[PDB]
Design goal:
Chain lengths: 48, 46
Amino acid sequence: DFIAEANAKGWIMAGSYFFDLVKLNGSATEDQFDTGTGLDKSSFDPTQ
Amino acid sequence: FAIMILVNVFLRPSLMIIGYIAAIALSYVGVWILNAGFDHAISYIQ
């Protein structure tokens, strides 16, 4: 979709799409575990 | 050998004035170049 604005946009910002272009040409050449569960934040003190 | 220098010393002052005023605005516009693209130039980066 970025191409349409690039047309409405000009050529004096071409560089700012550089990593977008790599996102395209590269695509032209181209066990699950829970993370952030929060059980680590629990606590257990035996001395209490 | 006198020519290129005699005009030289007679032009220079006005010339930096010419390069002064424009420069103030130019760098002005320069900032906005950045404002034109920076947020889109860091899109995937952020």
